[PDB]
Every structure is written in C-alpha cells, then in structure tokens.
Amino acid sequence: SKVTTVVATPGQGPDRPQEVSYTDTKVIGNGSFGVVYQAKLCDSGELVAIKKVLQDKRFKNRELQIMRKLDHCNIVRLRYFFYSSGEKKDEVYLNLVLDYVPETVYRVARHYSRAKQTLPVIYVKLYMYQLFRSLAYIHSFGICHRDIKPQNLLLDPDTAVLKLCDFGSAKQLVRGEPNVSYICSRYYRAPELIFGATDYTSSIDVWSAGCVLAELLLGQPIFPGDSGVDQLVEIIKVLGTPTREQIREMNPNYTEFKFPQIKAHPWTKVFRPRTPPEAIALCSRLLEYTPTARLTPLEACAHSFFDELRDPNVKLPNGRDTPALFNFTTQELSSNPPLATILIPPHARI
Amino acid sequence: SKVTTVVATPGQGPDRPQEVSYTDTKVIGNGSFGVVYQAKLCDSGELVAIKKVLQDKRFKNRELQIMRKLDHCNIVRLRYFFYSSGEKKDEVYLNLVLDYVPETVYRVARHYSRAKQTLPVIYVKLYMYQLFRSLAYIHSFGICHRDIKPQNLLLDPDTAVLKLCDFGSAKQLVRGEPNVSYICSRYYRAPELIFGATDYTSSIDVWSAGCVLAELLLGQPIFPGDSGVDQLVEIIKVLGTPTREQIREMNPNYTEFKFPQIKAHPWTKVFRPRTPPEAIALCSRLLEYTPTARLTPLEACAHSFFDELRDPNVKLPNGRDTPALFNFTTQELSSNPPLATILIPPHARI
Ligand SMILES: CN(C)CCNS(=O)(=O)c1ccc(-c2cnc(N)c(C(=O)Nc3cccnc3)n2)cc1
Ligand SMILES: CN(C)CCNS(=O)(=O)c1ccc(-c2cnc(N)c(C(=O)Nc3cccnc3)n2)cc1
C-alpha cells in the first residue's frame, strides 16, 4: 500500500518533531470543519484518526492549542500534528493525528432504537460516567466543549471505553468575556443558548450531557424541535414554565416575553416504568433552568446512579473487566477534592 | 359517519355565528402547537383543516388576531373559529377552521430529490411568485411570518395554487420593540437570527424565501447545519466572509468575533449548469448579509425570473391556465405602488 511520511510534532511534551509514517488512509468523516481520515501507523500498526482543517496563518488554531494541553483517558489524545497541502495552492492545512475509536454513542443508540430496544443500563452508566470525567477534566482548565452530542462521543465496543472528540467549538470561558450563543447542536442546547445569552458558563456542557442521558434512557431525544420555540415548548412540557428569576439566571433581557403556562410533568412519568429511580434523579439535577443549580461533572460522577460502577464485582456483559474508572488526578479533582472519598472506592488502585 | 355540529364565528366580517357541520375528521398534523385535523363540510362536501390549540386563560390568541385580519389568495383563510372542551379535562381549546390544501412544497421537493430529479422551473417560478405575494401582503400590515419553510407552503397539485400556512410564530414587528431571536426553523434562519439579534425586521422572511428558492433549484438545502456555527460556515462558503459593517447591520454586539476568511463562491458555480441565470440573480439579491440590501417581497415579484408568468401564453404543463397572479390590491401594492407597471402585465389590463 501507499506509505505517507511526514515530519510531525508530538502532541504533548517538548516540540521535537519526528518522522511519522502511516498507511491505509480512508475518509471516515466530512463536515463544515474539513475531513477526518483513518490511517495505520507503519511502525506499531496502531490505528489513528487524522483531522485535516484549512489553517490561516493570521491566527493560531484554537483547537490545536486546547488539544496540546489535554491528557485524559476519556478524551481522544493528540498524538502528533503537522502541516501539509490538500486541495488548493497557497492554502496550508493543519493535520491532527488523534486516537482512533471505532464507534459512536449516536450509532450505538440508533441500533437499539431501530431494534425497538433500549441500551442496557450498565452501558448508560459506563458511557455517562466516562463523559462526566472528560467534562470534569476540561472544565478544571476553564475549557467548555460547547458541542456535546452523541456523535462526539466515541466508543470502543470491546472495552466499553468512551472518548470525547471534536474540539472545534471548544473554548476557554473567562468571566466577563462574552461568548457566541450559536454554538451547540440542536436538541442538546441549554435554554440560555436558546435565549441568546453570551454570559453562559461550562454548565452548558452539563445540560447537553443530561440530554444525552435522557435520550439513552428514552430511546429518542428528550427535547426535539426544528426551531428554538419548539425546543423550549418541549423543555417547558417537562420542566414546567420557568419563573422570572429562572429566566433572569438564563438571559436577563428576555423576562418581558411570555411562554404557555404548563405545570411540571413528574420526571418519573417522563421515562418508561422500569427506569432506575437514580437515573431519573440524575436527569432532574442535570436538566435545571438555573445554570448554577445543575450538578458539576465531578458531582455527577459521585451520584448514586454510578454506584454499580464502584462495585468490586462489576464486569462487562462480554465478561471483561470494566475500563479505567478511578485513576483520578489532582487536576481532575480540583473543583471538589473531598469527592475522592466517594470517587475512588476502597478496592481501587492499590 | 359521525357528524360534529358547532356554532362558529366567521373568520372575517361581522360576528354573525354560523352553524357548521363537519364529518370524516382525521389527524393530518401533530406538533408542539397542538393538532391539525382534516374534515369534510357536511353540506358542500368541501375539505377544511381544523387547527386545535390550547386557549391561554391570561391573554387573547395572537394567531387568531392575525388570521382575522387576512384575506389573500396565497394564504390559508380563516373560515371560522370556535371554542371546545378538547382532550385534556376542564381546559378550553381554540379551533381554527382553515382552507385545506392537500400537498406541501416539502413533500413535492422530497419526491423529486428521492427520484434524483429537480422540480421543473415553471413550478419553481409559480411557487416562489405566490410565496412573495403572500409575504408582500402580510408585511404590508407590519406582520412577519417568522417560520417560512417548505412544510408551511401548501400546494394544490392540479391548479398550482400555493397557500402560506402556520401563523403560530407570526408577529406584528414594531420598530424599537425587541423580538425573540429563537423563532424560525433550522436551514431557513437569517444570519441576524443566528447572531441573536432582537431588532430584526420582516426581511428575515425574505432570507427564508431565498433559502426555499435555492433548495428547489439545488435539490437539497443550501445552508444545512445542526448548529448555528455550521450554518454560518455554509453561508460564508457561498456569500464570502461578512465585512465589519455587514456584521454591524445584522447584530452590532458580534463585530469583534472572527470567522474563517473565505472568498465569495461565484453563485453560477453553486447551482447545476442548466440553471436559469435569472434564478441565480434572484438568489443573490434575496440572500444578502445586510437585511436592508435584500429585495422586498413586492420587488422579488417584479424580478426578471418571473417574466414567463407575465407571458399571455403561459400554461401549466397539465394544460390548465395558471392560477390568479395579477389580482393585486392597493394594500398589497402599498410598499411601492409604481411596481404595478411591471406586476400587472399589458394583457391583464385589457
Ligand atoms: C461507517 N462509515 C460511514 C465510517 C465510520 N463512521 S462512524 O460514524 O462510525 C465514525 C466516525 C468517526 C470516528 C472517529 C474516530 N476517531 C476520531 N478521533 C474521530 C474524530 O476525531 N472525529 C471528529 C469528528 C468531527 C470533528 N472532529 C473530529 N472520529 C469513528 C467512527
Ligand atoms: C403524514 N401525512 C401523510 C399526513 C399529512 N399530509 S401532508 O404532510 O402532506 C399535509 C399536512 C398538512 C396539510 C395542511 C392542509 N391545510 C392546512 N390549512 C394545513 C395547516 O394549516 N397546517 C398547519 C401546520 C402546522 C401549524 N399550523 C398549521 N395543513 C396538508 C398536507
């Protein structure tokens, strides 16, 4: 097969470029951003993803700068980066050599939905926990992903490892600095984003994660709608009409406009009868109008819904051990170090 | 079959209640708003649509108040209105008895798209012209539809009559009064809406109409995207990067935020080779960053793309005469009365 050799910079550590050789290059995705390839490293035979985006030399690539800082088991790792040609002349392309993870939460959920089944709760627990760890980690650096959705949640079917991907919308959120309200994908947008707030926090990712949890439990999106109005109607049907203070906490200059007076639908009535009560309690605490009232990612990890993952006898349905779940760092725990007493169970990491 | 008899108020004119009897009630639509039924009037056998929404005890229904003012050949007419008990116990439902039109632009476009064909240009001309007349009319009253999309464009397959429907998001726009930015459906949203402007005008409907025209010509949406960021990338790819003044005209709070520097894609290169040059010129004049630079609906009617509709020999492909096209009123011409010299062709005067 065709072998491509490049001089690429390691993603972490010292800027010491090395020759990287890869083969079996196939397109695995396309989008507004550019293209995503799968390749096999000639050396190790290990599969990698190559995200290729057009780069302007007027400014530094924001995604590259965020990726260079990150090293977590639930986040696709930046292995190398290099510059190349691709489809123009004077146009330079930035290439991100990342961990390759073969499946997505989107594809897995759709299999179950099409087969009229729900994903077993053990996988809902494993996937959601790993997502909350990835979020606790990036938020500890002040970084908000801003595009949390099932398509950006990669899965290894055999190990049950989940890796967050796509840092194309990610941004370090600084208090008092305004941010664009048009980030985040339909169905997963926090109500503050729908109301056009520019003063939002990292808690928008927590709302998005709650939408993913509810969807994995329901078999379909909890807040669908092709417009913000329809999305808000779906939110109001479950949460009840937001109070004037709740509206003020989301977007201050939107208190005058009115919505239909709907009484709060009991959360137990939202989900099928055999839904674990702890799964419902987690949703209600993630899916809050007031951004400051939502659980933080680290607190969501410590929630009772994830107690089975902390059991020394837990195994995957395929008989394998669960993946790494307790290798917390000081960085990851920084928002609330006492939580480590729940997070790292007695049997873990000796 | 089951016969329902109600005492309803006529949609226009004096409050002289009429006894309305209907049969063969079927659900034709379901949504965040409520239900839309199809029914057959007992005496004429004529089909009607019944839009059943919940009546808010606090205020008067905005959609009903707008519908009561409208009487146009390209707008679904409010024939009658009445109140009922409905599905939910002890609450009041408003029932809007409307003209029933059997097809939608959405369904027709999807039939051609699935068959790998494009809708013949004569229908693109007929549908778009009738949509621009409906918009010239509502805008003459200061009313903005705010949800222009192929699903809200009803069609009669035999007569080629188009009727605008769904006034659930419609609002009278008053200068200096702020409006919600979360109206309008994905793909059809004006860039000002994406940027979260609350000072937008009726020209948001003109942008939406341009998206419908481009889509009928392309066979697919022109600006797709599951997020505002992706939609903006698609807009920038065609229109080119917006200038700081263009950004200021859309939303002034967004002047500082930077987008990727893309040169404007020539409009002729976006559509298939045999696309009429006049169709492309119409798109470019509807799909402008600056809201005030977009053609008004009445000016869009007067565009050269619609010259074939003004031909005395024009016929539908099925051999029938084209539907009513030149019966302009003083109300609908009010924005620019001199345009009547183009709009009402010499043969229509005779
Ligand atoms: C079956 N066909 C259509 C190909 C496989 N498609 S898929 O949806 O199962 C899929 C797509 C992407 C990835 C994947 C793997 N590793 C990655 N690291 C990335 C990645 O970084 N994706 C990404 C997407 C958008 C923007 N930036 C990055 N994607 C895995 C499976
Ligand atoms: C799924 N199919 C087979 C059933 C519906 N047929 S359809 O989608 O082609 C369709 C839907 C609606 C209408 C129709 C007809 N007359 C109307 N007057 C309305 C109407 O007012 N619709 C509407 C929709 C949403 C909100 N408000 C009003 N709709 C016609 C065809």
Side-chain angles (χ1 to χ4, degrees):
Chain A
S1 189
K2 193 182 107 173
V3 170
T4 302
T5 304
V6 293
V7 188
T9 310
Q12 293 81 47
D15 274 65
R16 298 273 164 266
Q18 53 181 84
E19 270 126 0
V20 176
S21 282
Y22 61 89
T23 192
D24 310 335
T25 302
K26 308 154 184 175
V27 170
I28 63 174
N30 258 285
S32 61
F33 63 89
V35 188
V36 179
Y37 303 87
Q38 182 206 90
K40 181 177 92 74
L41 295 172
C42 294
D43 218 268
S44 54
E46 170 161 68
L47 290 174
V48 294
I50 306 165
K51 181 186 185 166
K52 187 186 194 162
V53 306
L54 190 88
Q55 162 89 101
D56 194 318
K57 219 64 184 176
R58 71 173 161 176
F59 52 69
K60 284 208 146 195
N61 185 280
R62 178 136 87 199
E63 184 177 4
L64 173 66
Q65 308 326 313
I66 285 154
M67 294 306 290
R68 293 205 79 180
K69 302 187 170 181
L70 313 174
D71 179 46
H72 191 273
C73 63
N74 302 126
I75 305 167
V76 128
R77 189 171 77 84
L78 176 71
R79 298 161 167 257
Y80 303 104
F81 72 96
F82 65 94
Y83 298 93
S84 71
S85 55
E87 262 219 3
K88 331 231 177 281
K89 190 259 183 83
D90 96 293
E91 296 283 17
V92 185
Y93 293 85
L94 167 67
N95 300 256
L96 307 183
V97 184
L98 309 158
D99 286 337
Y100 168 82
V101 194
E103 276 294 334
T104 71
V105 164
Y106 176 83
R107 287 188 97 200
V108 176
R110 198 182 51 183
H111 160 93
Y112 286 88
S113 205
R114 281 173 177 168
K116 260 78 169 276
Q117 276 137 11
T118 49
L119 176 72
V121 189
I122 186 56
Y123 294 113
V124 179
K125 284 171 188 192
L126 285 155
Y127 298 163
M128 291 309 300
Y129 179 87
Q130 288 176 95
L131 167 59
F132 287 129
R133 274 196 76 188
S134 76
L135 290 183
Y137 180 79
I138 62 163
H139 294 180
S140 78
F141 290 105
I143 304 161
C144 188
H145 184 282
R146 309 199 297 176
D147 199 24
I148 301 287
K149 63 184 180 192
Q151 285 151 306
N152 287 337
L153 307 179
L154 311 176
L155 301 170
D156 187 305
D158 303 331
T159 66
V161 167
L162 177 147
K163 286 182 186 195
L164 178 56
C165 78
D166 186 8
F167 281 80
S169 306
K171 199 180 171 222
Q172 181 144 325
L173 301 186
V174 184
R175 207 167 176 170
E177 283 185 5
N179 305 290
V180 305
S181 68
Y182 54 82
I183 40 73
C184 206
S185 297
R186 59 164 206 151
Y187 302 169
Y188 310 96
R189 308 181 88 231
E192 321 88 89
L193 296 179
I194 305 178
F195 290 127
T198 54
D199 70 330
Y200 61 87
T201 65
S202 288
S203 67
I204 66 152
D205 285 348
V206 168
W207 176 274
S208 294
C211 289
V212 174
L213 170 62
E215 177 167 348
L216 292 181
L217 298 175
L218 285 168
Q220 62 182 259
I222 190 158
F223 311 130
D226 299 334
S227 61
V229 229
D230 293 357
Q231 284 161 20
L232 248 11
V233 168
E234 296 308 314
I235 294 161
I236 292 153
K237 280 188 196 168
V238 177
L239 274 71
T241 315
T243 72
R244 70 163 107 188
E245 195 46 47
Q246 278 173 331
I247 293 147
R248 198 202 186 194
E249 297 214 61
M250 294 183 277
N251 186 315
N253 53 82
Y254 263 70
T255 315
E256 199 271 337
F257 322 114
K258 257 282 116 178
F259 323 93
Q261 198 67 220
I262 304 298
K263 282 176 279 182
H265 195 131
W267 273 112
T268 313
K269 275 214 60 99
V270 174
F271 304 98
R272 72 185 175 88
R274 273 169 275 101
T275 298
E278 303 83 1
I280 298 161
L282 221 200
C283 288
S284 71
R285 294 293 329 275
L286 298 167
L287 297 173
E288 294 280 8
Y289 282 125
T290 309
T292 58
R294 303 166 188 157
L295 292 179
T296 58
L298 205 68
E299 285 166 1
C301 285
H303 188 280
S304 297
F305 178 59
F306 303 115
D307 289 353
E308 183 179 7
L309 302 189
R310 285 178 284 268
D311 191 314
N313 306 312
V314 74
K315 286 266 135 122
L316 298 185
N318 66 186
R320 296 195 201 203
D321 283 319
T322 58
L325 298 176
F326 318 116
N327 53 348
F328 286 93
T329 63
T330 298
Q331 183 67 64
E332 193 169 3
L333 293 163
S334 67
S335 74
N336 197 334
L339 285 178
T341 73
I342 293 158
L343 297 171
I344 311 170
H347 71 278
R349 285 167 45 85
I350 310 129
Chain B
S1 186
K2 192 186 260 187
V3 170
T4 302
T5 305
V6 289
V7 187
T9 308
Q12 294 81 47
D15 186 5
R16 255 69 199 272
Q18 305 205 140
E19 201 152 85
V20 183
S21 282
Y22 61 88
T23 192
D24 310 335
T25 301
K26 308 153 184 175
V27 172
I28 63 176
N30 246 297
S32 60
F33 63 90
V35 198
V36 185
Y37 300 89
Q38 181 206 89
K40 181 177 92 74
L41 296 173
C42 292
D43 297 280
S44 55
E46 169 163 275
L47 291 173
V48 296
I50 306 164
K51 181 190 189 150
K52 188 176 194 164
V53 298
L54 252 176
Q55 177 252 88
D56 198 322
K57 299 144 183 180
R58 298 173 294 188
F59 49 85
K60 283 202 149 196
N61 186 280
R62 177 138 87 200
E63 185 177 5
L64 173 66
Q65 308 327 313
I66 285 154
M67 295 305 291
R68 293 206 79 179
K69 302 187 170 186
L70 314 174
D71 179 47
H72 192 274
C73 61
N74 302 126
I75 305 168
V76 115
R77 189 173 70 86
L78 176 72
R79 289 170 179 233
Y80 303 103
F81 73 96
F82 64 93
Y83 298 92
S84 68
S85 61
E87 197 261 303
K88 282 202 270 180
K89 202 180 177 172
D90 301 292
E91 31 224 283
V92 189
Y93 286 82
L94 167 67
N95 299 257
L96 305 182
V97 185
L98 305 160
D99 290 330
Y100 169 82
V101 191
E103 275 295 336
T104 73
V105 163
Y106 175 84
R107 288 233 306 181
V108 162
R110 196 186 53 183
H111 170 275
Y112 284 86
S113 203
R114 281 172 176 169
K116 259 79 174 76
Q117 277 280 282
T118 51
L119 175 72
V121 187
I122 186 56
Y123 293 115
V124 178
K125 284 171 188 192
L126 285 155
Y127 298 164
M128 292 309 301
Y129 179 85
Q130 288 176 95
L131 167 58
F132 287 130
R133 275 196 75 188
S134 76
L135 290 183
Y137 181 79
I138 62 163
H139 294 180
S140 78
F141 290 105
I143 304 161
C144 189
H145 185 281
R146 309 200 296 176
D147 199 23
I148 301 287
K149 62 185 180 192
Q151 284 153 306
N152 286 338
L153 306 179
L154 311 176
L155 300 171
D156 187 306
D158 303 329
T159 67
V161 165
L162 177 147
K163 285 182 187 197
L164 178 57
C165 77
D166 186 8
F167 282 80
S169 308
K171 199 180 170 222
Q172 181 145 325
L173 302 185
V174 184
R175 204 171 198 181
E177 284 185 4
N179 305 290
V180 304
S181 68
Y182 54 81
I183 40 74
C184 205
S185 296
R186 58 164 207 150
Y187 301 170
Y188 310 96
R189 309 180 87 230
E192 321 87 89
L193 297 179
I194 305 178
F195 290 127
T198 54
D199 71 327
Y200 61 87
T201 66
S202 288
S203 68
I204 66 152
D205 285 349
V206 169
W207 176 275
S208 295
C211 289
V212 174
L213 170 62
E215 176 168 347
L216 291 180
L217 298 175
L218 285 168
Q220 62 182 250
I222 191 158
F223 311 129
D226 296 335
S227 60
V229 230
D230 293 0
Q231 287 159 16
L232 249 11
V233 168
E234 296 309 314
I235 294 160
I236 292 153
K237 280 187 196 168
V238 177
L239 276 69
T241 315
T243 72
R244 70 163 120 177
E245 196 46 47
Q246 277 173 329
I247 293 147
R248 199 202 191 189
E249 295 156 310
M250 292 180 293
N251 181 311
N253 301 66
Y254 280 69
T255 320
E256 34 269 10
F257 311 101
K258 35 256 283 168
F259 321 92
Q261 196 65 24
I262 276 99
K263 279 190 91 186
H265 196 131
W267 276 105
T268 314
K269 277 218 294 106
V270 351
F271 305 95
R272 73 184 174 89
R274 272 168 275 100
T275 297
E278 301 84 1
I280 298 160
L282 221 200
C283 289
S284 71
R285 294 292 330 274
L286 298 167
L287 297 172
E288 294 280 10
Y289 282 125
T290 310
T292 58
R294 298 183 195 141
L295 293 180
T296 59
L298 206 67
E299 286 166 0
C301 285
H303 200 97
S304 66
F305 177 59
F306 304 115
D307 289 352
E308 183 178 6
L309 302 189
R310 284 177 284 270
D311 190 313
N313 305 313
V314 74
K315 286 266 137 172
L316 298 185
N318 66 188
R320 297 195 201 203
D321 280 318
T322 58
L325 298 176
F326 319 111
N327 56 346
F328 286 93
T329 65
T330 306
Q331 186 65 64
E332 78 187 298
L333 291 164
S334 68
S335 75
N336 197 334
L339 284 178
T341 73
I342 294 157
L343 297 171
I344 309 170
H347 83 271
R349 307 187 192 155
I350 300 158

